[PDB]
Short mmCIF file of C-alpha atoms in Angstrom, two decimals:
data_model
loop_
_atom_site.label_atom_id
_atom_site.label_comp_id
_atom_site.label_asym_id
_atom_site.label_seq_id
_atom_site.Cartn_x
_atom_site.Cartn_y
_atom_site.Cartn_z
CA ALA A 2 23.48 -87.51 -11.89
CA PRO A 3 20.79 -87.35 -14.60
CA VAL A 4 22.16 -85.88 -17.80
CA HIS A 5 21.96 -82.13 -18.23
CA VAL A 6 19.25 -81.36 -20.78
CA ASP A 7 18.86 -78.67 -23.44
CA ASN A 8 15.51 -77.41 -22.07
CA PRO A 9 14.66 -78.32 -18.45
CA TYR A 10 11.03 -77.21 -19.06
CA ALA A 11 10.27 -79.63 -21.89
CA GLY A 12 7.77 -82.23 -20.69
CA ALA A 13 8.10 -80.87 -17.13
CA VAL A 14 5.88 -79.28 -14.55
CA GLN A 15 6.88 -76.15 -12.62
CA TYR A 16 7.02 -75.60 -8.86
CA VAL A 17 4.03 -73.88 -7.30
CA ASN A 18 4.92 -71.79 -4.25
CA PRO A 19 2.41 -72.55 -1.43
CA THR A 20 3.31 -69.34 0.44
CA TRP A 21 2.46 -67.16 -2.57
CA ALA A 22 -0.56 -69.32 -3.29
CA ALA A 23 -1.80 -68.65 0.24
CA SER A 24 -1.33 -64.89 -0.27
CA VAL A 25 -3.36 -65.08 -3.47
CA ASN A 26 -6.12 -67.11 -1.83
CA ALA A 27 -6.27 -64.62 1.04
CA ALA A 28 -6.66 -61.81 -1.52
CA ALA A 29 -9.45 -63.86 -3.15
CA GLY A 30 -11.23 -64.12 0.20
CA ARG A 31 -11.15 -60.32 0.49
CA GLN A 32 -13.05 -60.19 -2.80
CA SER A 33 -16.15 -61.80 -1.22
CA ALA A 34 -18.20 -58.87 -2.54
CA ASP A 35 -17.01 -59.60 -6.12
CA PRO A 36 -17.28 -63.43 -6.36
CA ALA A 37 -16.34 -63.60 -10.07
CA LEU A 38 -13.10 -61.73 -9.34
CA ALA A 39 -12.43 -63.97 -6.36
CA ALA A 40 -12.84 -67.03 -8.65
CA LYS A 41 -10.22 -65.62 -11.10
CA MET A 42 -7.85 -64.98 -8.20
CA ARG A 43 -8.23 -68.62 -7.13
CA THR A 44 -7.17 -69.69 -10.62
CA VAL A 45 -4.06 -67.48 -10.39
CA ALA A 46 -3.13 -69.19 -7.07
CA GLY A 47 -2.52 -72.47 -8.88
CA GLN A 48 0.16 -71.12 -11.18
CA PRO A 49 3.94 -71.53 -10.73
CA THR A 50 6.06 -68.53 -9.73
CA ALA A 51 9.76 -68.15 -8.97
CA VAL A 52 11.11 -67.98 -5.41
CA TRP A 53 13.31 -64.93 -4.96
CA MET A 54 16.47 -65.02 -2.87
CA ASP A 55 16.37 -61.23 -2.74
CA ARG A 56 18.50 -60.95 0.40
CA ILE A 57 20.73 -63.18 2.52
CA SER A 58 18.01 -63.61 5.15
CA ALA A 59 15.75 -65.23 2.57
CA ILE A 60 18.04 -68.31 2.50
CA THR A 61 17.11 -69.42 6.02
CA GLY A 62 13.76 -67.52 6.17
CA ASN A 63 12.35 -64.12 7.16
CA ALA A 64 9.07 -62.21 7.31
CA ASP A 65 8.47 -62.81 3.60
CA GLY A 66 9.23 -66.53 3.30
CA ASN A 67 10.07 -69.84 4.94
CA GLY A 68 13.62 -70.31 3.57
CA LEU A 69 15.13 -72.05 0.56
CA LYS A 70 15.11 -75.55 2.05
CA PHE A 71 11.38 -75.34 2.60
CA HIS A 72 10.84 -74.75 -1.12
CA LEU A 73 13.33 -77.38 -2.29
CA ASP A 74 11.65 -80.00 -0.03
CA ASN A 75 8.24 -78.94 -1.33
CA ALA A 76 9.53 -79.18 -4.91
CA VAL A 77 10.71 -82.79 -4.47
CA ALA A 78 7.26 -83.71 -3.12
CA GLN A 79 5.53 -81.93 -6.05
CA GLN A 80 7.81 -83.75 -8.52
CA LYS A 81 6.91 -87.10 -6.97
CA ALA A 82 3.19 -86.37 -7.36
CA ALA A 83 3.67 -85.24 -10.96
CA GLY A 84 5.69 -88.27 -12.12
CA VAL A 85 7.52 -86.13 -14.72
CA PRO A 86 10.46 -83.72 -14.32
CA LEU A 87 9.85 -80.61 -12.32
CA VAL A 88 11.48 -77.18 -12.66
CA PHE A 89 11.88 -75.05 -9.52
CA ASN A 90 12.32 -71.39 -10.55
CA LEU A 91 14.85 -69.64 -8.27
CA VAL A 92 15.98 -66.00 -8.56
CA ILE A 93 19.59 -65.13 -7.70
CA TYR A 94 19.40 -61.45 -6.86
CA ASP A 95 21.88 -59.95 -4.38
CA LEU A 96 24.89 -58.58 -6.27
CA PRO A 97 27.10 -55.98 -4.57
CA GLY A 98 25.85 -52.59 -5.76
CA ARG A 99 22.59 -54.18 -6.94
CA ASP A 100 20.40 -52.06 -9.17
CA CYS A 101 23.09 -49.46 -9.74
CA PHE A 102 20.90 -47.17 -11.93
CA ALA A 103 18.30 -46.71 -9.08
CA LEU A 104 18.80 -43.35 -7.38
CA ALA A 105 18.80 -45.11 -4.01
CA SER A 106 20.90 -47.81 -2.40
CA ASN A 107 18.62 -50.73 -3.21
CA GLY A 108 21.08 -53.68 -2.65
CA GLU A 109 21.99 -54.80 0.84
CA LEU A 110 25.58 -55.49 -0.20
CA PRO A 111 27.77 -52.46 -1.02
CA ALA A 112 29.83 -52.25 -4.19
CA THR A 113 33.08 -52.98 -2.36
CA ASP A 114 35.44 -55.94 -1.97
CA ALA A 115 33.85 -56.62 1.40
CA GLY A 116 30.44 -56.72 -0.25
CA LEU A 117 31.69 -59.15 -2.89
CA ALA A 118 33.28 -61.40 -0.26
CA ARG A 119 29.89 -61.57 1.50
CA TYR A 120 28.12 -62.21 -1.80
CA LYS A 121 30.37 -65.21 -2.39
CA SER A 122 30.54 -66.70 1.11
CA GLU A 123 27.17 -65.78 2.71
CA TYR A 124 24.91 -65.66 -0.34
CA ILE A 125 26.05 -67.85 -3.27
CA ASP A 126 27.88 -70.45 -1.19
CA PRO A 127 24.94 -71.38 1.10
CA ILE A 128 22.49 -71.40 -1.87
CA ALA A 129 24.81 -73.69 -3.87
CA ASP A 130 25.37 -75.89 -0.78
CA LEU A 131 21.60 -76.44 -0.55
CA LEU A 132 21.10 -76.90 -4.32
CA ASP A 133 23.91 -79.49 -4.49
CA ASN A 134 22.46 -81.68 -1.74
CA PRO A 135 21.73 -85.20 -3.08
CA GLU A 136 18.22 -84.80 -1.63
CA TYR A 137 17.42 -82.54 -4.60
CA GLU A 138 18.82 -84.58 -7.48
CA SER A 139 15.21 -85.52 -8.41
CA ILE A 140 14.31 -81.93 -9.34
CA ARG A 141 15.65 -79.37 -11.78
CA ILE A 142 16.39 -75.77 -10.74
CA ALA A 143 16.07 -72.93 -13.28
CA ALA A 144 18.19 -70.15 -11.70
CA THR A 145 17.36 -66.69 -13.04
CA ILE A 146 20.76 -65.01 -12.68
CA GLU A 147 20.73 -61.43 -11.33
CA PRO A 148 17.97 -59.31 -12.85
CA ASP A 149 18.85 -55.66 -13.49
CA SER A 150 22.61 -56.23 -13.53
CA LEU A 151 24.96 -56.64 -16.48
CA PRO A 152 23.15 -54.40 -19.06
CA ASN A 153 23.60 -51.42 -16.76
CA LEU A 154 27.26 -51.61 -17.73
CA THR A 155 26.58 -50.77 -21.35
CA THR A 156 23.63 -48.38 -21.01
CA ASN A 157 23.93 -46.71 -17.58
CA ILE A 158 27.71 -46.47 -17.03
CA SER A 159 27.43 -42.70 -16.81
CA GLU A 160 26.10 -43.17 -13.30
CA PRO A 161 28.95 -43.41 -10.75
CA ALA A 162 27.15 -46.19 -8.87
CA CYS A 163 27.23 -48.33 -12.02
CA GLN A 164 30.96 -47.59 -12.57
CA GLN A 165 31.53 -48.73 -9.00
CA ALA A 166 29.36 -51.81 -9.41
CA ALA A 167 30.83 -52.90 -12.78
CA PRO A 168 33.76 -55.06 -11.49
CA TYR A 169 31.48 -56.64 -8.89
CA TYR A 170 28.74 -57.48 -11.41
CA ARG A 171 31.33 -59.14 -13.62
CA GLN A 172 33.04 -61.04 -10.82
CA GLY A 173 29.80 -61.80 -8.95
CA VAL A 174 28.00 -63.17 -11.95
CA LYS A 175 31.09 -65.28 -12.84
CA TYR A 176 31.07 -66.69 -9.34
CA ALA A 177 27.33 -67.46 -9.40
CA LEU A 178 27.68 -69.14 -12.77
CA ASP A 179 30.74 -71.13 -11.76
CA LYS A 180 29.16 -72.42 -8.53
CA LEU A 181 25.72 -73.12 -9.99
CA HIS A 182 26.81 -74.64 -13.31
CA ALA A 183 28.88 -77.18 -11.34
CA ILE A 184 25.55 -78.62 -10.09
CA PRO A 185 24.19 -80.78 -12.95
CA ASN A 186 20.47 -80.21 -12.24
CA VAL A 187 20.86 -76.42 -12.15
CA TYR A 188 20.09 -74.49 -15.38
CA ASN A 189 21.36 -70.92 -15.50
CA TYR A 190 19.22 -68.31 -17.28
CA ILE A 191 21.01 -64.96 -17.49
CA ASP A 192 18.74 -61.93 -17.28
CA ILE A 193 18.62 -59.84 -20.46
CA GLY A 194 16.47 -56.91 -19.45
CA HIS A 195 13.63 -56.19 -21.89
CA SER A 196 13.06 -54.48 -25.22
CA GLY A 197 12.28 -51.09 -23.66
CA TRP A 198 15.80 -51.07 -22.26
CA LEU A 199 18.00 -52.96 -24.74
CA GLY A 200 16.05 -53.19 -28.01
CA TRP A 201 18.05 -50.46 -29.79
CA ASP A 202 20.92 -51.84 -31.86
CA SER A 203 23.27 -49.51 -29.95
CA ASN A 204 22.30 -51.26 -26.68
CA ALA A 205 21.57 -54.81 -27.81
CA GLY A 206 24.89 -55.26 -29.58
CA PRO A 207 27.24 -54.22 -26.78
CA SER A 208 25.10 -56.17 -24.31
CA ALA A 209 25.47 -59.41 -26.29
CA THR A 210 29.24 -58.87 -26.46
CA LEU A 211 29.39 -58.28 -22.69
CA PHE A 212 27.44 -61.51 -22.05
CA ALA A 213 29.95 -63.40 -24.18
CA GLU A 214 32.84 -61.86 -22.19
CA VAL A 215 31.18 -62.98 -18.96
CA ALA A 216 30.69 -66.51 -20.40
CA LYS A 217 34.36 -66.73 -21.46
CA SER A 218 35.42 -65.68 -17.93
CA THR A 219 33.73 -68.68 -16.33
CA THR A 220 35.52 -72.00 -15.86
CA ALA A 221 33.11 -73.84 -18.19
CA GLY A 222 32.90 -71.05 -20.80
CA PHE A 223 29.74 -70.90 -22.85
CA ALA A 224 28.37 -74.05 -21.17
CA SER A 225 27.93 -72.04 -17.96
CA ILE A 226 24.86 -70.30 -19.37
CA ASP A 227 21.92 -72.45 -20.47
CA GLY A 228 19.73 -69.60 -21.71
CA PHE A 229 18.45 -66.09 -21.21
CA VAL A 230 15.31 -64.57 -19.67
CA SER A 231 13.64 -61.29 -20.61
CA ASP A 232 10.98 -59.05 -19.02
CA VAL A 233 11.61 -60.20 -15.46
CA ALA A 234 9.59 -58.00 -13.12
CA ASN A 235 8.68 -55.80 -16.06
CA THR A 236 5.56 -55.30 -18.14
CA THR A 237 6.65 -54.94 -21.75
CA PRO A 238 4.06 -56.89 -23.78
CA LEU A 239 4.68 -60.32 -25.17
CA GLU A 240 3.30 -59.09 -28.52
CA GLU A 241 1.94 -55.83 -29.83
CA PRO A 242 -0.93 -57.27 -31.94
CA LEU A 243 -1.90 -54.04 -33.71
CA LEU A 244 1.62 -52.68 -34.01
CA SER A 245 3.05 -55.84 -35.59
CA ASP A 246 5.35 -54.09 -38.10
CA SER A 247 7.91 -51.87 -36.41
CA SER A 248 9.22 -50.72 -39.84
CA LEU A 249 5.79 -49.28 -40.82
CA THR A 250 6.00 -45.74 -42.10
CA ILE A 251 3.01 -43.40 -42.35
CA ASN A 252 3.42 -40.56 -44.84
CA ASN A 253 7.21 -41.01 -44.87
CA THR A 254 7.39 -41.04 -41.02
CA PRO A 255 8.42 -44.27 -39.25
CA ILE A 256 6.08 -45.21 -36.43
CA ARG A 257 9.13 -46.27 -34.47
CA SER A 258 10.08 -42.56 -34.30
CA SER A 259 7.04 -42.01 -32.04
CA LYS A 260 7.67 -40.64 -28.55
CA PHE A 261 6.82 -44.05 -27.10
CA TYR A 262 9.37 -46.03 -29.11
CA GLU A 263 12.28 -43.57 -29.55
CA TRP A 264 13.39 -45.29 -32.80
CA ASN A 265 13.52 -48.81 -31.27
CA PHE A 266 12.57 -51.60 -33.63
CA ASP A 267 11.65 -54.01 -30.80
CA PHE A 268 8.07 -53.25 -29.66
CA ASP A 269 7.59 -56.49 -27.73
CA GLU A 270 9.36 -59.40 -26.13
CA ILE A 271 8.75 -61.93 -28.90
CA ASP A 272 10.71 -59.66 -31.23
CA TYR A 273 13.27 -58.86 -28.55
CA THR A 274 14.05 -62.50 -27.75
CA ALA A 275 14.44 -63.30 -31.46
CA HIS A 276 16.74 -60.27 -31.82
CA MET A 277 18.90 -61.17 -28.81
CA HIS A 278 19.09 -64.86 -29.73
CA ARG A 279 20.60 -63.81 -33.08
CA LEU A 280 23.12 -61.38 -31.49
CA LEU A 281 24.11 -63.77 -28.73
CA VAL A 282 24.82 -66.58 -31.19
CA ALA A 283 26.86 -64.19 -33.35
CA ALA A 284 28.77 -63.14 -30.22
CA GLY A 285 29.85 -66.75 -29.53
CA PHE A 286 26.98 -68.54 -27.83
CA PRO A 287 25.83 -71.92 -29.28
CA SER A 288 22.63 -71.80 -31.26
CA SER A 289 21.12 -74.24 -28.68
CA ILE A 290 20.67 -71.40 -26.10
CA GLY A 291 17.01 -71.03 -25.21
CA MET A 292 14.98 -68.01 -24.13
CA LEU A 293 12.38 -67.35 -21.43
CA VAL A 294 9.91 -64.47 -21.07
CA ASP A 295 8.53 -63.49 -17.68
CA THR A 296 4.79 -63.15 -18.57
CA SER A 297 3.69 -62.44 -15.01
CA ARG A 298 2.54 -58.85 -15.61
CA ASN A 299 2.81 -58.09 -19.33
CA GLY A 300 -0.74 -58.89 -20.54
CA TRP A 301 -2.04 -55.32 -20.85
CA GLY A 302 -5.66 -56.49 -20.96
CA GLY A 303 -8.91 -55.18 -19.57
CA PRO A 304 -11.16 -52.52 -21.09
CA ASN A 305 -8.31 -50.18 -22.02
CA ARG A 306 -6.74 -52.68 -24.38
CA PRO A 307 -7.27 -51.56 -28.03
CA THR A 308 -9.05 -54.24 -30.06
CA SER A 309 -8.65 -52.90 -33.61
CA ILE A 310 -6.48 -50.44 -35.47
CA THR A 311 -7.48 -46.83 -34.98
CA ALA A 312 -6.59 -44.98 -38.16
CA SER A 313 -4.38 -41.89 -37.92
CA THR A 314 -2.10 -39.77 -40.13
CA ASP A 315 0.05 -38.82 -37.09
CA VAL A 316 2.55 -41.37 -35.89
CA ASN A 317 2.20 -40.49 -32.17
CA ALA A 318 -1.62 -40.64 -32.29
CA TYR A 319 -1.34 -43.87 -34.25
CA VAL A 320 1.06 -45.47 -31.75
CA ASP A 321 -0.72 -44.13 -28.71
CA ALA A 322 -4.15 -45.41 -29.86
CA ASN A 323 -2.88 -48.82 -30.97
CA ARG A 324 -0.23 -49.91 -28.43
CA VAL A 325 -1.34 -52.33 -25.74
CA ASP A 326 1.46 -51.18 -23.42
CA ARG A 327 -0.32 -48.28 -21.72
CA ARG A 328 2.63 -46.96 -19.72
CA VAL A 329 3.71 -43.37 -19.87
CA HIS A 330 7.11 -44.53 -21.11
CA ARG A 331 8.78 -47.90 -21.59
CA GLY A 332 11.36 -47.13 -18.85
CA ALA A 333 8.64 -47.16 -16.15
CA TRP A 334 9.68 -50.26 -14.17
CA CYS A 335 8.10 -49.59 -10.75
CA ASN A 336 4.46 -50.62 -10.26
CA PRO A 337 3.22 -48.97 -13.51
CA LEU A 338 -0.49 -48.26 -13.40
CA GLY A 339 -2.84 -50.50 -15.33
CA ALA A 340 -0.62 -53.56 -15.94
CA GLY A 341 -2.32 -56.96 -16.19
CA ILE A 342 -1.25 -60.57 -15.86
CA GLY A 343 0.01 -62.17 -19.05
CA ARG A 344 0.18 -65.69 -20.46
CA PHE A 345 0.14 -68.48 -17.89
CA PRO A 346 3.45 -70.31 -17.51
CA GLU A 347 3.84 -72.91 -20.29
CA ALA A 348 6.59 -75.14 -21.63
CA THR A 349 7.77 -74.63 -25.24
CA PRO A 350 4.99 -72.30 -26.40
CA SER A 351 4.18 -72.61 -30.08
CA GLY A 352 4.04 -70.05 -32.82
CA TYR A 353 7.25 -68.13 -32.11
CA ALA A 354 10.01 -70.19 -33.70
CA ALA A 355 12.54 -67.41 -34.11
CA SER A 356 12.37 -66.56 -30.38
CA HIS A 357 13.72 -70.01 -29.35
CA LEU A 358 11.44 -70.08 -26.31
CA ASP A 359 12.01 -72.78 -23.72
CA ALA A 360 8.96 -71.61 -21.73
CA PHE A 361 6.85 -68.77 -20.53
CA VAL A 362 7.42 -68.33 -16.77
CA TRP A 363 6.20 -66.10 -13.95
CA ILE A 364 9.47 -64.92 -12.41
CA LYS A 365 8.04 -61.91 -10.57
CA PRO A 366 5.08 -63.21 -8.51
CA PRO A 367 1.89 -61.23 -9.36
CA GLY A 368 0.77 -59.17 -6.41
CA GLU A 369 4.20 -58.43 -4.97
CA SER A 370 5.16 -54.76 -5.04
CA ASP A 371 8.15 -53.47 -6.98
CA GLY A 372 8.91 -50.94 -4.27
CA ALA A 373 7.29 -48.45 -1.93
CA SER A 374 5.67 -45.30 -3.33
CA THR A 375 6.63 -43.04 -0.41
CA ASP A 376 9.62 -42.91 1.95
CA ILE A 377 7.92 -45.06 4.63
CA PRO A 378 9.87 -46.00 7.77
CA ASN A 379 10.36 -49.76 7.81
CA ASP A 380 12.06 -52.62 9.60
CA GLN A 381 13.72 -53.85 6.38
CA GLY A 382 15.92 -50.79 6.13
CA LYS A 383 14.74 -50.45 2.54
CA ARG A 384 15.24 -47.12 0.80
CA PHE A 385 12.92 -44.97 -1.27
CA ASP A 386 13.24 -44.89 -5.08
CA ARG A 387 11.45 -42.02 -6.81
CA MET A 388 10.80 -44.24 -9.85
CA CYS A 389 8.07 -45.71 -7.63
CA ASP A 390 6.77 -42.22 -6.73
CA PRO A 391 3.55 -41.08 -8.45
CA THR A 392 4.63 -37.44 -7.98
CA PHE A 393 8.03 -37.78 -9.72
CA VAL A 394 8.73 -36.39 -13.19
CA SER A 395 11.59 -38.58 -14.27
CA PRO A 396 14.41 -37.64 -16.64
CA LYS A 397 14.65 -41.43 -17.32
CA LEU A 398 11.16 -41.18 -18.86
CA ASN A 399 11.77 -38.20 -21.20
CA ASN A 400 10.62 -35.77 -18.47
CA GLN A 401 7.27 -37.45 -17.73
CA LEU A 402 5.51 -38.68 -14.59
CA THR A 403 6.25 -42.27 -13.53
CA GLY A 404 2.63 -43.35 -13.67
CA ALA A 405 3.48 -45.45 -10.61
CA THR A 406 0.65 -47.04 -8.62
CA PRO A 407 0.11 -45.11 -5.32
CA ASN A 408 -0.06 -46.66 -1.87
CA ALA A 409 2.62 -49.26 -2.76
CA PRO A 410 4.36 -51.23 0.01
CA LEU A 411 7.99 -52.34 0.06
CA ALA A 412 9.27 -54.63 -2.66
CA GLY A 413 7.97 -58.17 -2.17
CA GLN A 414 5.06 -57.14 0.05
CA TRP A 415 1.46 -57.79 -0.98
CA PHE A 416 0.02 -54.92 -3.03
CA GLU A 417 -3.74 -55.21 -2.69
CA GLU A 418 -4.92 -52.71 -5.34
CA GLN A 419 -2.25 -53.71 -7.81
CA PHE A 420 -3.25 -57.38 -7.64
CA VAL A 421 -6.90 -56.46 -8.22
CA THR A 422 -5.86 -54.53 -11.36
CA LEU A 423 -3.43 -57.24 -12.48
CA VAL A 424 -6.27 -59.83 -12.44
CA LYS A 425 -8.92 -57.52 -13.90
CA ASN A 426 -6.57 -56.57 -16.71
CA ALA A 427 -5.19 -60.04 -17.50
CA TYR A 428 -4.66 -60.94 -21.15
CA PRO A 429 -5.53 -63.69 -21.98
CA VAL A 430 -8.57 -63.41 -19.73
CA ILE A 431 -8.51 -65.63 -16.65
CA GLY A 432 -11.19 -68.23 -16.04
CA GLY A 433 -12.58 -68.79 -12.59
CA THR A 434 -11.99 -71.73 -10.26
CA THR A 435 -14.70 -72.75 -7.74
CA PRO A 436 -14.23 -75.34 -5.00
CA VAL A 437 -16.74 -78.18 -5.04
CA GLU A 438 -18.29 -77.17 -1.69
CA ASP A 439 -19.45 -73.85 -3.21
CA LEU A 440 -21.39 -75.60 -6.03
CA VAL A 441 -24.35 -76.38 -3.72
CA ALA A 442 -26.90 -73.82 -2.70
CA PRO A 443 -25.87 -72.72 0.82
CA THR A 444 -27.84 -74.35 3.57
#
């Protein structure tokens, strides 16, 4: 009933998930021997993260969460206490043939008509039925729409699983957008990958065109999509502070031709969001579209972060000494070693006008694994993806090891060592929070 706004984050607070906060606080308690680190973890626990509907069972509740209604009810209470609008971040993530480029069957719904019928009736419909309840008119929902989906159709269509998934990604995203856009307090942010996947002109361009086709297939057209979100569950840095000029040439050799960048001009997500905003508008979207970056794990801080330019005559040595992204390769999506927490969630961050940023958000919740690092038997029926395997030399990474973090649990499970590293390596640094009872000398 309230009017639908251009940017639901402006002047708003964001939902804080008490279940994830409790997981963070438990991790902090396990750092009793390192009280300064525990204090930083306590600060992290106060930050807003998205709630993932990563399977049908998450709607009513499962071993990983208490159900969607629990969060919506919590969000209305948090909005009342804030006295300003509140955005509840929700991830829509269950397409038939999900994650078609993974060499594994990662999605619970197969890429078949039966899978699509279940996506519509047992996944989207119950979510929309809850979101449309008049009980929730007092909150805003920012729905991140299907990470790791549509751009596979323009970059990874050589994989048969992506060919099979293609009609279901198009029809499933259309259905999600149609059902969710009909709810006036829902704001749809289409996932746009990240610069290490789509920054090349040959990938960015066709992706923007495909997003416009999807928009035009919906009943409301371009109005169905409020904005776009990059870097979800990835680690590509917000900015490369030392490599700020991707056109720099050293002795007639472009630094973008380095092994790490593979001729891509987009070294970071600020540049990528500016690039995609341009292309999306040119493809038919209104200039009012806004962008989000998932800053949950893209900080690349800690002692390994370069602090000044190391001089070199060789483009690879120059890039490798000066990049803050310390991954083996920008395609390393599964628990890459050394990642740190990035900027805290924030409405309308300043200083990046061309990126048209509605907010920085934590879509992936820091501490949750991207996937298991070995083929562990499990009561989720989840399957093993070698991109999470520290032993795997991946063709997707120019024949290099994944650099994945070992001893990783299933996706969504708490990853103890990874969270320690994420907090230690945060950029900006994290300040500590100390409860009042711990300010007195213990007696």
